[PDB]
Ligand binder design. Structure first.
Ligand SMILES: O=C(O)CCc1nc2cc(Cl)ccc2s1
Length: 167
């Protein structure tokens, strides 16, 4: 038994809720929150800017030190950093950005990072401003992630469509 509330169960291991990932992290304080990162860990907008804003920019300060030491992530890759005031840990995961020409086949690689963590609060990778089809992203999530994932879908209307079209 964990602390996630009001999620609809899609599979043995995948749960979904129409909710803002920021407000959910603040309430639950999960072990792992997933950020929809880019390879530079430049958290300007979407999940990354909203998560970063909620940390008062401490996520961006930590991230800049990480990049100065290690260089950029790979598309499909990840790193574990602090969760600040939102979670124990933040798993920064880089899904492909369709609005930049990145290979959508890298979405499966991106979701494989989640398998290193027993439980996660996450957004749909490559959905929203990343320009990929969220229905596809949910299918890849269900078919790739084997650990327990709690998906926070921000768009109400999208949430209803994801549930109603789920196979
Ligand atoms: O779930 C969706 O509706 C699409 C992917 C998401 N995009 C964002 C953007 C922000 Cl600022 C906050 C949470 C989310 S989750």
């Amino acid at each position: 038994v964990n602390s996630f509330s009001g999620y609809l169960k899609l599979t043995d291991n995948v749960y979904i809720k129409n909710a803002d990932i920021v407000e959910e992290a603040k309430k639950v304080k999960p072990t792992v929150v997933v950020n929809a990162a880019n390879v530079y860990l430049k958290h300007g907008g979407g999940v990354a800017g909203a998560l970063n804003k909620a940390t008062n920019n401490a996520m961006q300060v930590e991230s800049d030190d990480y990049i100065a030491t290690n260089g950029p992530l790979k598309v499909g890759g990840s790193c574990v950093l602090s969760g600040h005031n939102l979670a124990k840990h933040c798993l920064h995961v880089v899904g492909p950005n369709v609005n930049k020409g990145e290979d959508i086949q890298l979405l499966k690689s991106a979701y494989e990072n989640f398998n290193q963590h027993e439980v996660l609060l996450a957004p749909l990778l490559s959905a929203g401003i990343f320009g990929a089809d969220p229905i596809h992203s949910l299918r890849v999530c269900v078919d790739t992630v084997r650990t327990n994932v709690y998906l926070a879908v921000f768009d109400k209307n999208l949430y209803d469509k994801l549930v109603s079209s789920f196979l």
